[PDB]
Amino acid sequence: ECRVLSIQSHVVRGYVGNRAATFPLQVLGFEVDAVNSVQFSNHTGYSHWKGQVLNSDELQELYDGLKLNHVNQYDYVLTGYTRDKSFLAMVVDIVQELKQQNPRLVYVCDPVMGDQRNGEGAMYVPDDLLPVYREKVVPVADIITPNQFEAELLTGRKIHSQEEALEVMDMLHSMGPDTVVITSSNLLSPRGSDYLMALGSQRTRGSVVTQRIRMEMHKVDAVFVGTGDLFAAMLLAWTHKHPNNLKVACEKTVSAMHHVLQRTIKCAKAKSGEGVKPSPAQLELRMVQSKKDIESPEIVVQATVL
Amino acid sequence: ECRVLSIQSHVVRGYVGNRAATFPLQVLGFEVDAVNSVQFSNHTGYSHWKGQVLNSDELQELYDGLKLNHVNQYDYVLTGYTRDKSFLAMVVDIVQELKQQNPRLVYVCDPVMGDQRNGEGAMYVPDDLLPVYREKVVPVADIITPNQFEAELLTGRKIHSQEEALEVMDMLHSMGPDTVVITSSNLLSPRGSDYLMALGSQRTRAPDGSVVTQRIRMEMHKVDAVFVGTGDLFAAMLLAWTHKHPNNLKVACEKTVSAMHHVLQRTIKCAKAKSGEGVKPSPAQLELRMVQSKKDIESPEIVVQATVL
């Protein structure tokens, strides 16, 4: 039995934050405890949204409830989008304390910054969260999934090539996490300009061996919300099943991603009128219908070892 | 695609309310939209619990959000434990508006009253709720799943035998719902004292004005332990199986109750193993083994037969 504490947004309709992470982890066999950092009607890709936010004091009370009952034993912690630095600082305190009674606990973190759509009713992540991610979060995180933009902010460097990316990833390793994945970048894939390139690095174990990989997936003709949340949740699951093989973990995670996205776009175009661009409501991830692909994804991508 | 609006409690750890209802419906293939009426660390069966509650205004804000985006189209609405009358009344306004939008919408309601353990940090359900359930909720509900106590309160009549239970179910049908399932009762089952007896009734009105009523009885062997969230899990699976078997309450209930049996057997086996020999499992150890029961929820092997009355 593996127990995950996931602290992310909750939307009534659709998939983002905890909605995008819970179902996948459950069908894969993980026990998921979900703290909903906010509760909104839907994500920010729609024209309207309403809801309420949970403050750091409220998050503390919920955790204390678990502590008072002596049920605060976790194997994993999972976090993502946050637009509140005080909330984030509270998350760090909770993780450190959890790692105290279980030094084997793995903290998976997606350090979201910028203007990514989300389920917390925000248009942007405050610039002041950067120092908190750099100095408090990353140092205690074991697996991080920054996109290029985020990897550059965290290291103060700019990536202009594949070589600089590996250097940036090494710096991230020195900051703390043994597994780093740059989920997307603007690096032109040598396979074509329509493929999105992803890079992965894993320090295993006197000399620590580093396993580096690169992957490429063809872009999809649409804008989706919650894909970063789904990606991190499935990577958690597969790295747990393949602890020393980042290659297989990523191939399964990226393949699953492909199956869900393809089914989603196909359904969206079928529900929209002819020659009409699908709306955000029509583009919600087809989560429930992709159950089998999530459980056992047909491999459609091959990672090359660098 | 069948879309369900489920308005129930949320707990960080464990299974009760929306936590007990969501996963099962999703694995059965339903699109579940979940409004969390509260958010607590765990259910009220533990010695401690902390959390926040939503008032009726906050429920209205969330629904207005769906309405403003024109995505307030549902096939089902599902509610359970509710501790405040204002919230319950708001739920009724929502159901009525959605039924205007879709006349085929089915409202599944578990009218929890009394002192049932919950995820809403309540010790008891206020009496001021009974009037609302009788006059506002039940009349717009299509499927209701009260226990014996709740059926008696709703109709104002006590049940002393199987026959009276059927009369009470007929009274509930007259109040509104075409499908009524009394989930548990204090009635002595033919099979033996170690069996739990549940009764179901589905009323269908024919074109010529005649009425056909399917009445069934089900007996499940008891499990010696106190579980929480079983009523929520029951209502959610009943919703899925009646959808697949719209005119066959017998098959819908056999599948639902059978799935319950598989989930509870796996749960009690794991609880006893964790507590050790001679020690009674604690509420933390008795949390439903939801995730591990995926296959049994998806296609439960039939272990109980409904007797047609």
Coordinates of C-alpha atoms in Angstrom, one line a residue:
Chain A
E1 CA 0.0 0.0 0.0
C2 CA 1.4 3.4 -1.1
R3 CA -0.2 6.6 0.4
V4 CA 0.0 9.9 -1.4
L5 CA -0.9 13.3 0.2
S6 CA -1.9 15.6 -2.7
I7 CA -2.4 19.3 -2.0
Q8 CA -3.8 21.0 -5.1
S9 CA -6.9 22.7 -6.5
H10 CA -10.4 21.3 -6.8
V11 CA -12.8 22.3 -9.5
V12 CA -16.5 21.1 -9.6
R13 CA -16.4 20.5 -13.3
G14 CA -13.4 19.4 -15.4
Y15 CA -9.9 18.4 -14.7
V16 CA -7.0 20.4 -13.2
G17 CA -5.1 20.1 -9.9
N18 CA -6.4 17.4 -7.7
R19 CA -9.1 16.5 -10.2
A20 CA -6.5 15.7 -12.8
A21 CA -4.2 13.8 -10.3
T22 CA -6.6 11.7 -8.2
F23 CA -8.4 9.4 -10.6
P24 CA -5.2 8.3 -12.4
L25 CA -3.4 7.5 -9.1
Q26 CA -6.4 5.7 -7.8
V27 CA -6.8 3.4 -10.9
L28 CA -3.1 2.7 -10.7
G29 CA -3.5 1.4 -7.1
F30 CA -2.3 4.3 -4.9
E31 CA -4.2 5.5 -1.8
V32 CA -4.7 9.2 -2.3
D33 CA -5.5 11.7 0.5
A34 CA -6.6 14.9 -1.1
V35 CA -6.3 18.4 0.5
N36 CA -8.2 20.8 -1.8
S37 CA -6.3 24.1 -1.7
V38 CA -9.3 25.9 -3.3
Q39 CA -12.7 24.9 -4.6
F40 CA -13.8 26.6 -7.8
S41 CA -16.6 26.0 -10.3
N42 CA -14.1 25.4 -13.1
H43 CA -10.7 26.3 -14.4
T44 CA -9.5 29.7 -15.7
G45 CA -9.8 28.9 -19.4
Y46 CA -13.5 29.5 -19.3
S47 CA -15.1 33.0 -19.4
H48 CA -16.3 32.9 -15.8
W49 CA -15.3 31.3 -12.5
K50 CA -16.4 31.4 -8.9
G51 CA -15.2 29.8 -5.8
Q52 CA -13.3 30.1 -2.5
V53 CA -9.7 29.8 -1.5
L54 CA -8.2 27.9 1.5
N55 CA -5.7 30.0 3.5
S56 CA -2.5 28.7 5.2
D57 CA -4.2 28.6 8.7
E58 CA -7.0 26.4 7.3
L59 CA -4.4 24.1 5.7
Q60 CA -2.7 23.8 9.0
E61 CA -5.9 22.8 10.8
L62 CA -6.6 20.0 8.3
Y63 CA -3.1 18.6 8.8
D64 CA -3.4 18.9 12.6
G65 CA -6.5 16.8 12.4
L66 CA -4.5 14.1 10.7
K67 CA -1.7 14.5 13.3
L68 CA -4.1 14.3 16.2
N69 CA -5.4 11.0 15.0
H70 CA -1.9 9.7 14.3
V71 CA -2.6 9.1 10.7
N72 CA 0.0 11.4 9.2
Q73 CA 2.1 8.6 7.7
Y74 CA 2.8 9.1 4.0
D75 CA 5.0 7.6 1.3
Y76 CA 4.6 10.5 -1.1
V77 CA 3.6 14.2 -1.1
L78 CA 2.4 15.8 -4.4
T79 CA 2.0 19.6 -5.0
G80 CA 1.7 21.8 -8.0
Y81 CA 0.1 25.2 -8.8
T82 CA 0.0 27.8 -6.0
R83 CA -0.5 31.5 -6.1
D84 CA 0.0 32.1 -2.4
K85 CA 3.5 32.2 -0.9
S86 CA 2.3 31.8 2.6
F87 CA 0.4 28.6 1.6
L88 CA 3.6 27.3 -0.1
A89 CA 5.7 28.0 3.0
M90 CA 3.2 26.0 5.1
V91 CA 3.6 23.1 2.6
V92 CA 7.3 23.0 3.2
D93 CA 6.9 22.8 7.0
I94 CA 4.5 19.9 6.6
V95 CA 6.8 18.1 4.2
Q96 CA 9.8 18.4 6.5
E97 CA 7.9 17.1 9.4
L98 CA 6.6 14.2 7.3
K99 CA 10.1 13.3 6.2
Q100 CA 11.1 13.2 9.9
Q101 CA 8.9 10.1 10.7
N102 CA 9.6 8.6 7.3
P103 CA 12.9 9.5 5.7
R104 CA 12.0 7.5 2.6
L105 CA 9.1 9.8 1.8
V106 CA 9.2 11.1 -1.8
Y107 CA 8.1 14.7 -2.5
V108 CA 7.0 15.2 -6.1
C109 CA 6.8 18.9 -7.1
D110 CA 5.7 20.8 -10.2
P111 CA 7.0 24.4 -9.5
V112 CA 4.4 26.3 -11.5
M113 CA 5.1 30.0 -12.3
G114 CA 4.0 32.4 -15.0
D115 CA 0.5 32.7 -16.5
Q116 CA -0.5 29.0 -16.9
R117 CA -4.3 28.4 -16.8
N118 CA -5.4 26.8 -13.5
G119 CA -8.2 26.0 -11.1
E120 CA -7.5 28.8 -8.5
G121 CA -9.1 31.7 -10.3
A122 CA -5.8 33.4 -10.9
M123 CA -4.4 35.2 -14.0
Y124 CA -0.7 34.9 -12.9
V125 CA 1.6 33.5 -10.2
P126 CA 3.2 36.3 -8.2
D127 CA 6.8 36.9 -9.0
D128 CA 7.6 36.7 -5.3
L129 CA 7.1 33.0 -5.2
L130 CA 10.4 32.4 -7.0
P131 CA 12.6 32.9 -4.0
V132 CA 10.4 30.6 -2.0
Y133 CA 10.6 27.8 -4.6
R134 CA 14.4 28.3 -5.0
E135 CA 15.3 28.4 -1.3
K136 CA 12.7 26.3 0.5
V137 CA 10.8 24.0 -1.8
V138 CA 13.3 22.6 -4.3
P139 CA 15.9 21.8 -1.6
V140 CA 13.4 19.3 0.0
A141 CA 11.9 18.0 -3.3
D142 CA 12.9 14.7 -4.7
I143 CA 11.2 14.8 -8.2
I144 CA 10.6 18.1 -9.9
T145 CA 8.9 18.7 -13.3
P146 CA 9.6 22.3 -14.4
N147 CA 9.0 23.4 -17.9
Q148 CA 11.9 25.3 -19.6
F149 CA 10.7 28.8 -18.4
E150 CA 10.6 27.5 -14.8
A151 CA 13.9 25.7 -15.0
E152 CA 15.6 29.0 -16.2
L153 CA 14.0 31.0 -13.4
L154 CA 15.1 28.6 -10.7
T155 CA 18.7 28.6 -11.9
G156 CA 19.1 32.1 -13.2
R157 CA 20.4 30.7 -16.5
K158 CA 19.0 30.6 -20.0
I159 CA 18.8 27.5 -22.2
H160 CA 19.8 28.0 -25.8
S161 CA 20.7 24.4 -26.6
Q162 CA 20.5 20.8 -25.4
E163 CA 23.9 21.1 -23.8
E164 CA 22.9 24.1 -21.7
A165 CA 19.7 22.2 -20.6
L166 CA 21.8 19.3 -19.2
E167 CA 23.9 21.9 -17.4
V168 CA 20.7 23.5 -16.0
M169 CA 19.4 20.1 -14.9
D170 CA 22.7 19.4 -13.1
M171 CA 22.4 22.6 -11.1
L172 CA 18.9 21.5 -10.1
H173 CA 20.3 18.2 -8.9
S174 CA 22.8 20.1 -6.8
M175 CA 19.9 22.1 -5.2
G176 CA 18.4 18.8 -4.0
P177 CA 16.1 16.6 -6.3
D178 CA 17.6 13.4 -7.6
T179 CA 15.1 13.3 -10.5
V180 CA 14.5 16.2 -12.8
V181 CA 12.3 16.4 -15.9
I182 CA 12.0 19.4 -18.1
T183 CA 8.5 18.7 -19.4
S184 CA 8.6 21.0 -22.3
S185 CA 11.1 23.3 -24.0
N186 CA 11.5 25.6 -27.0
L187 CA 14.5 23.6 -28.2
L188 CA 14.1 22.6 -31.8
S189 CA 13.9 18.8 -31.9
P190 CA 16.4 17.3 -34.4
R191 CA 13.4 15.1 -35.5
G192 CA 11.2 18.0 -36.6
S193 CA 9.8 21.4 -35.7
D194 CA 6.4 20.0 -34.8
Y195 CA 7.7 17.7 -32.0
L196 CA 7.9 19.0 -28.4
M197 CA 11.1 18.0 -26.7
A198 CA 11.4 16.7 -23.1
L199 CA 14.5 16.0 -21.1
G200 CA 15.0 13.8 -18.1
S201 CA 17.8 13.3 -15.7
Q202 CA 18.1 10.9 -12.7
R203 CA 21.0 10.7 -10.2
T204 CA 21.0 7.1 -8.9
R205 CA 23.0 6.2 -5.7
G206 CA 31.3 6.5 -4.6
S207 CA 30.4 8.2 -7.8
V208 CA 26.7 8.7 -8.4
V209 CA 25.6 7.5 -11.8
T210 CA 23.4 9.9 -13.8
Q211 CA 20.9 8.6 -16.3
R212 CA 19.9 11.1 -19.0
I213 CA 17.2 10.9 -21.6
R214 CA 15.4 12.9 -24.3
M215 CA 11.9 12.4 -25.6
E216 CA 9.8 13.9 -28.4
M217 CA 6.1 14.0 -28.9
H218 CA 4.2 15.6 -31.8
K219 CA 2.3 18.7 -30.7
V220 CA -1.4 18.6 -30.5
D221 CA -3.7 21.0 -32.4
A222 CA -5.3 22.6 -29.3
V223 CA -4.9 24.2 -25.9
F224 CA -5.5 22.0 -22.9
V225 CA -5.6 22.8 -19.1
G226 CA -4.3 20.4 -16.4
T227 CA -1.9 18.4 -18.6
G228 CA 1.0 19.3 -16.3
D229 CA -0.9 18.1 -13.3
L230 CA -1.8 14.8 -15.0
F231 CA 1.8 14.3 -16.1
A232 CA 3.3 14.7 -12.6
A233 CA 0.7 12.3 -11.1
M234 CA 1.5 9.6 -13.6
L235 CA 5.2 10.1 -13.4
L236 CA 4.9 9.5 -9.6
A237 CA 3.2 6.2 -10.3
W238 CA 5.6 4.9 -12.9
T239 CA 8.8 6.0 -11.1
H240 CA 7.5 4.0 -8.2
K241 CA 7.1 0.9 -10.3
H242 CA 10.5 1.5 -12.1
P243 CA 12.6 3.2 -9.3
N244 CA 15.9 2.7 -11.2
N245 CA 14.7 3.1 -14.8
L246 CA 13.7 6.7 -15.7
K247 CA 13.6 5.6 -19.3
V248 CA 10.7 3.2 -18.9
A249 CA 8.9 5.5 -16.4
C250 CA 8.9 8.4 -18.9
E251 CA 8.0 6.2 -21.9
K252 CA 4.9 4.9 -20.1
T253 CA 4.0 8.4 -18.7
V254 CA 4.4 10.1 -22.1
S255 CA 2.6 7.3 -23.9
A256 CA -0.4 7.6 -21.5
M257 CA -0.4 11.3 -22.1
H258 CA -0.6 10.8 -25.8
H259 CA -3.6 8.4 -25.5
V260 CA -5.5 10.8 -23.3
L261 CA -4.8 13.8 -25.5
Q262 CA -5.7 12.1 -28.7
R263 CA -9.0 10.8 -27.4
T264 CA -9.7 14.3 -26.0
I265 CA -9.1 16.2 -29.2
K266 CA -11.0 13.7 -31.3
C267 CA -14.1 13.9 -29.0
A268 CA -13.9 17.7 -28.9
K269 CA -13.9 18.0 -32.7
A270 CA -16.8 15.6 -32.9
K271 CA -19.0 17.6 -30.5
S272 CA -18.3 20.9 -32.1
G273 CA -19.9 22.1 -35.3
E274 CA -18.2 21.6 -38.6
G275 CA -15.3 24.0 -39.1
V276 CA -15.8 25.3 -35.6
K277 CA -12.9 25.4 -33.1
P278 CA -13.7 23.4 -30.0
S279 CA -14.4 25.5 -26.9
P280 CA -12.6 25.0 -23.5
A281 CA -15.7 23.3 -22.2
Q282 CA -15.4 20.7 -25.0
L283 CA -11.7 20.3 -24.4
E284 CA -11.8 19.1 -20.8
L285 CA -9.6 15.9 -20.6
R286 CA -11.5 12.7 -21.3
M287 CA -10.3 11.2 -18.0
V288 CA -12.9 8.6 -17.2
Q289 CA -13.0 7.3 -20.8
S290 CA -9.2 6.8 -20.9
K291 CA -9.1 4.5 -17.9
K292 CA -7.5 1.5 -19.7
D293 CA -4.9 3.7 -21.4
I294 CA -3.9 5.1 -18.0
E295 CA -3.7 1.6 -16.5
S296 CA -1.7 0.0 -19.3
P297 CA -0.6 2.5 -22.0
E298 CA 0.5 1.1 -25.4
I299 CA 4.0 2.5 -25.8
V300 CA 4.1 5.0 -28.7
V301 CA 7.4 6.9 -27.9
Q302 CA 11.0 5.8 -27.5
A303 CA 13.3 7.7 -25.2
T304 CA 16.9 8.0 -26.4
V305 CA 19.7 7.6 -23.8
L306 CA 22.1 10.6 -23.8
Chain B
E1 CA -21.8 10.4 -21.6
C2 CA -23.8 10.5 -18.3
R3 CA -23.0 13.4 -16.1
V4 CA -23.6 13.4 -12.4
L5 CA -23.7 16.4 -10.0
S6 CA -22.8 15.1 -6.6
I7 CA -23.1 17.4 -3.6
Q8 CA -21.6 15.8 -0.5
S9 CA -18.9 16.0 2.1
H10 CA -15.2 15.8 1.4
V11 CA -12.6 14.2 3.8
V12 CA -8.9 14.4 3.2
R13 CA -8.3 10.8 4.4
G14 CA -10.8 8.0 4.1
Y15 CA -14.1 7.4 2.5
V16 CA -17.5 9.1 3.2
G17 CA -19.6 11.4 1.1
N18 CA -18.1 12.5 -2.2
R19 CA -15.0 10.3 -1.4
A20 CA -17.1 7.2 -1.1
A21 CA -19.2 8.1 -4.2
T22 CA -16.8 9.6 -6.8
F23 CA -14.3 6.8 -7.5
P24 CA -17.0 4.1 -7.9
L25 CA -19.0 6.2 -10.4
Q26 CA -15.8 7.1 -12.3
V27 CA -14.7 3.5 -12.7
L28 CA -18.2 2.7 -13.9
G29 CA -17.8 5.2 -16.6
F30 CA -19.8 8.3 -15.3
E31 CA -18.6 11.9 -15.6
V32 CA -18.8 13.1 -11.9
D33 CA -18.9 16.8 -11.1
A34 CA -18.3 17.1 -7.3
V35 CA -19.4 20.0 -5.1
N36 CA -17.7 19.5 -1.7
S37 CA -20.2 20.7 1.0
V38 CA -17.4 20.5 3.7
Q39 CA -13.8 19.6 3.9
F40 CA -12.6 17.7 7.0
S41 CA -9.5 15.8 7.8
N42 CA -11.4 12.6 8.4
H43 CA -14.9 11.4 9.3
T44 CA -16.6 12.0 12.7
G45 CA -15.9 8.4 13.8
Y46 CA -12.3 9.3 14.8
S47 CA -11.7 10.8 18.2
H48 CA -10.6 14.0 16.5
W49 CA -11.5 16.0 13.3
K50 CA -10.9 19.5 12.0
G51 CA -12.1 21.3 8.8
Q52 CA -14.3 23.9 7.2
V53 CA -17.9 24.0 6.1
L54 CA -19.7 25.7 3.2
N55 CA -22.8 27.7 3.7
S56 CA -25.7 28.0 1.3
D57 CA -24.3 31.2 -0.3
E58 CA -21.1 29.5 -1.2
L59 CA -23.0 26.6 -2.8
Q60 CA -25.0 29.1 -4.8
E61 CA -21.7 30.8 -6.0
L62 CA -20.4 27.5 -7.4
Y63 CA -23.6 26.7 -9.2
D64 CA -23.8 30.2 -10.6
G65 CA -20.3 29.6 -12.1
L66 CA -21.6 26.6 -14.0
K67 CA -24.7 28.5 -15.1
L68 CA -22.7 31.5 -16.3
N69 CA -20.5 29.2 -18.5
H70 CA -23.6 27.4 -19.8
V71 CA -22.4 24.0 -18.5
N72 CA -25.2 23.3 -16.1
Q73 CA -26.6 20.3 -18.0
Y74 CA -26.8 17.1 -15.9
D75 CA -28.3 13.7 -16.2
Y76 CA -28.2 13.0 -12.5
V77 CA -28.0 14.8 -9.2
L78 CA -26.9 12.9 -6.1
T79 CA -27.1 14.1 -2.5
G80 CA -26.6 12.6 1.0
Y81 CA -25.8 13.8 4.5
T82 CA -26.6 17.5 5.0
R83 CA -26.5 19.2 8.4
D84 CA -28.2 22.5 7.7
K85 CA -31.7 23.3 6.4
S86 CA -30.6 26.4 4.4
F87 CA -28.1 24.3 2.4
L88 CA -30.7 21.5 1.8
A89 CA -33.3 24.1 0.6
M90 CA -30.7 25.5 -1.8
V91 CA -30.1 22.0 -3.2
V92 CA -33.8 21.7 -3.9
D93 CA -33.9 25.0 -5.8
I94 CA -31.0 23.7 -8.0
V95 CA -32.6 20.4 -8.7
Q96 CA -35.8 22.1 -9.8
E97 CA -34.0 24.4 -12.2
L98 CA -32.0 21.5 -13.7
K99 CA -35.1 19.5 -14.2
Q100 CA -36.6 22.5 -16.1
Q101 CA -33.4 22.3 -18.3
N102 CA -33.7 18.4 -18.6
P103 CA -37.0 16.6 -17.8
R104 CA -35.1 13.3 -18.0
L105 CA -32.9 14.2 -15.1
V106 CA -32.9 11.7 -12.2
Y107 CA -32.4 12.9 -8.6
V108 CA -31.0 10.2 -6.3
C109 CA -31.3 11.1 -2.6
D110 CA -30.1 9.5 0.6
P111 CA -32.2 11.4 3.2
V112 CA -29.8 11.0 6.2
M113 CA -31.3 11.9 9.5
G114 CA -30.6 11.0 13.2
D115 CA -27.1 10.3 14.5
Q116 CA -25.3 8.7 11.5
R117 CA -21.5 9.1 11.5
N118 CA -20.5 11.6 8.8
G119 CA -17.9 13.7 7.2
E120 CA -19.7 17.0 8.2
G121 CA -18.4 17.0 11.8
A122 CA -21.9 16.8 13.1
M123 CA -23.0 14.9 16.1
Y124 CA -26.6 14.7 15.1
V125 CA -29.0 15.9 12.3
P126 CA -31.2 18.8 13.5
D127 CA -35.0 18.0 13.6
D128 CA -35.7 21.2 11.7
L129 CA -34.5 19.2 8.6
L130 CA -37.4 16.6 8.7
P131 CA -40.0 19.2 7.4
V132 CA -37.7 20.1 4.5
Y133 CA -37.1 16.5 3.5
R134 CA -40.9 15.7 3.7
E135 CA -42.3 18.7 1.8
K136 CA -39.4 19.8 -0.4
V137 CA -36.8 17.1 -1.1
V138 CA -38.8 13.9 -1.3
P139 CA -41.4 15.3 -3.7
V140 CA -38.7 16.1 -6.4
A141 CA -36.6 12.9 -5.8
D142 CA -36.8 9.9 -8.2
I143 CA -34.8 7.4 -6.2
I144 CA -34.4 7.5 -2.4
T145 CA -32.5 5.2 -0.1
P146 CA -33.6 5.7 3.5
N147 CA -32.9 3.2 6.3
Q148 CA -35.9 2.0 8.4
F149 CA -35.7 4.9 10.8
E150 CA -35.7 7.5 8.1
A151 CA -38.6 5.9 6.3
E152 CA -40.6 6.0 9.5
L153 CA -39.8 9.6 10.1
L154 CA -40.7 10.6 6.5
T155 CA -44.1 8.9 6.5
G156 CA -44.8 9.4 10.2
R157 CA -45.5 5.7 10.6
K158 CA -43.7 2.9 12.5
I159 CA -42.6 -0.3 10.9
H160 CA -43.2 -3.6 12.9
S161 CA -43.2 -6.1 10.0
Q162 CA -42.3 -6.7 6.4
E163 CA -45.9 -6.1 5.4
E164 CA -46.0 -2.6 7.1
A165 CA -42.6 -1.9 5.4
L166 CA -44.2 -2.4 2.0
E167 CA -47.1 -0.1 3.0
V168 CA -44.6 2.6 4.1
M169 CA -42.8 2.2 0.7
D170 CA -46.1 2.6 -1.1
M171 CA -46.7 5.8 1.0
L172 CA -43.2 7.1 -0.1
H173 CA -44.1 6.4 -3.8
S174 CA -47.1 8.6 -3.4
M175 CA -44.9 11.4 -2.0
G176 CA -43.0 11.3 -5.3
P177 CA -40.1 8.8 -6.0
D178 CA -40.8 5.9 -8.3
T179 CA -37.9 3.9 -6.7
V180 CA -37.6 3.3 -3.0
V181 CA -34.9 1.1 -1.3
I182 CA -35.0 0.6 2.5
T183 CA -31.2 -0.1 2.9
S184 CA -31.4 -1.7 6.4
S185 CA -34.0 -2.6 8.9
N186 CA -34.6 -4.1 12.4
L187 CA -36.8 -6.8 10.8
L188 CA -36.1 -10.5 11.5
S189 CA -34.9 -12.1 8.3
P190 CA -36.1 -15.6 7.3
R191 CA -32.5 -16.7 6.5
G192 CA -31.5 -16.1 10.2
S193 CA -30.7 -13.4 12.8
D194 CA -27.2 -12.9 11.4
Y195 CA -28.7 -11.5 8.2
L196 CA -29.4 -7.9 7.3
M197 CA -32.7 -7.3 5.5
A198 CA -33.2 -4.7 2.9
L199 CA -36.3 -4.0 0.8
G200 CA -36.9 -2.4 -2.5
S201 CA -39.8 -1.1 -4.6
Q202 CA -40.2 0.3 -8.1
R203 CA -43.5 1.7 -9.3
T204 CA -44.3 2.0 -13.0
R205 CA -47.4 3.7 -14.4
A206 CA -48.8 2.1 -17.6
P207 CA -50.4 4.0 -20.5
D208 CA -53.9 2.7 -19.6
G209 CA -53.5 4.1 -16.0
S210 CA -52.7 0.8 -14.4
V211 CA -49.8 0.6 -12.0
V212 CA -47.2 -2.1 -11.7
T213 CA -45.0 -2.3 -8.7
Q214 CA -41.9 -4.6 -8.4
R215 CA -41.2 -5.4 -4.8
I216 CA -38.1 -7.2 -3.6
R217 CA -36.4 -8.4 -0.5
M218 CA -32.6 -9.0 0.0
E219 CA -30.7 -10.6 2.8
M220 CA -26.9 -10.0 3.3
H221 CA -24.9 -11.7 6.0
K222 CA -23.7 -9.1 8.6
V223 CA -20.1 -8.2 9.1
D224 CA -19.2 -7.7 12.8
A225 CA -17.7 -4.2 12.6
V226 CA -18.9 -0.6 12.3
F227 CA -18.2 0.9 9.0
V228 CA -18.7 4.5 7.9
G229 CA -19.7 5.7 4.4
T230 CA -21.5 2.5 3.3
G231 CA -24.7 4.4 2.8
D232 CA -22.9 6.8 0.5
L233 CA -21.2 4.0 -1.4
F234 CA -24.6 2.1 -1.7
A235 CA -26.5 5.1 -3.2
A236 CA -23.7 5.8 -5.7
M237 CA -23.6 2.2 -7.0
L238 CA -27.4 2.0 -7.1
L239 CA -27.4 5.1 -9.3
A240 CA -25.0 3.4 -11.8
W241 CA -26.8 0.0 -11.9
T242 CA -30.4 1.4 -12.2
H243 CA -29.0 3.4 -15.1
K244 CA -27.9 0.2 -16.9
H245 CA -31.1 -1.7 -15.7
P246 CA -33.8 1.0 -15.8
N247 CA -36.7 -1.4 -15.5
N248 CA -35.2 -4.1 -13.5
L249 CA -34.7 -3.1 -9.8
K250 CA -34.0 -6.8 -9.0
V251 CA -30.8 -7.0 -11.1
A252 CA -29.8 -3.4 -10.1
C253 CA -30.0 -4.3 -6.4
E254 CA -28.3 -7.7 -6.8
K255 CA -25.2 -6.1 -8.4
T256 CA -25.2 -3.2 -5.9
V257 CA -25.5 -5.4 -2.8
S258 CA -23.0 -7.9 -4.2
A259 CA -20.4 -5.2 -4.8
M260 CA -21.0 -4.0 -1.2
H261 CA -20.3 -7.5 0.1
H262 CA -17.0 -7.7 -1.8
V263 CA -15.8 -4.3 -0.6
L264 CA -16.7 -5.1 3.1
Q265 CA -15.1 -8.5 3.1
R266 CA -11.8 -7.2 1.7
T267 CA -12.1 -4.3 4.2
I268 CA -12.7 -6.4 7.4
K269 CA -9.9 -8.9 6.3
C270 CA -7.4 -6.1 6.0
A271 CA -8.5 -4.4 9.2
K272 CA -8.1 -7.5 11.4
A273 CA -4.7 -8.3 9.9
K274 CA -3.6 -4.7 10.8
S275 CA -5.0 -4.7 14.3
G276 CA -3.5 -8.0 15.3
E277 CA -5.0 -11.0 17.1
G278 CA -7.6 -10.3 19.7
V279 CA -7.5 -6.5 19.2
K280 CA -10.6 -4.8 17.7
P281 CA -9.9 -2.8 14.6
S282 CA -10.0 1.0 15.1
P283 CA -11.9 3.5 12.8
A284 CA -8.7 4.3 11.0
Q285 CA -8.1 0.6 10.2
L286 CA -11.8 0.2 9.1
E287 CA -11.7 2.7 6.3
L288 CA -13.2 1.1 3.2
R289 CA -10.6 -0.5 0.9
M290 CA -11.9 1.5 -2.1
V291 CA -9.0 1.5 -4.5
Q292 CA -8.2 -2.2 -3.9
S293 CA -11.8 -3.1 -4.8
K294 CA -11.8 -1.6 -8.3
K295 CA -12.4 -4.9 -10.1
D296 CA -15.3 -5.9 -7.8
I297 CA -16.9 -2.5 -8.3
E298 CA -16.6 -2.7 -12.1
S299 CA -18.1 -6.2 -12.3
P300 CA -19.2 -7.7 -9.1
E301 CA -19.7 -11.5 -8.9
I302 CA -23.4 -12.0 -7.8
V303 CA -23.5 -13.4 -4.3
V304 CA -27.0 -12.4 -3.2
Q305 CA -30.4 -13.1 -4.7
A306 CA -33.3 -10.7 -4.5
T307 CA -36.6 -12.5 -3.6
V308 CA -39.6 -11.1 -5.6
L309 CA -42.5 -10.2 -3.3

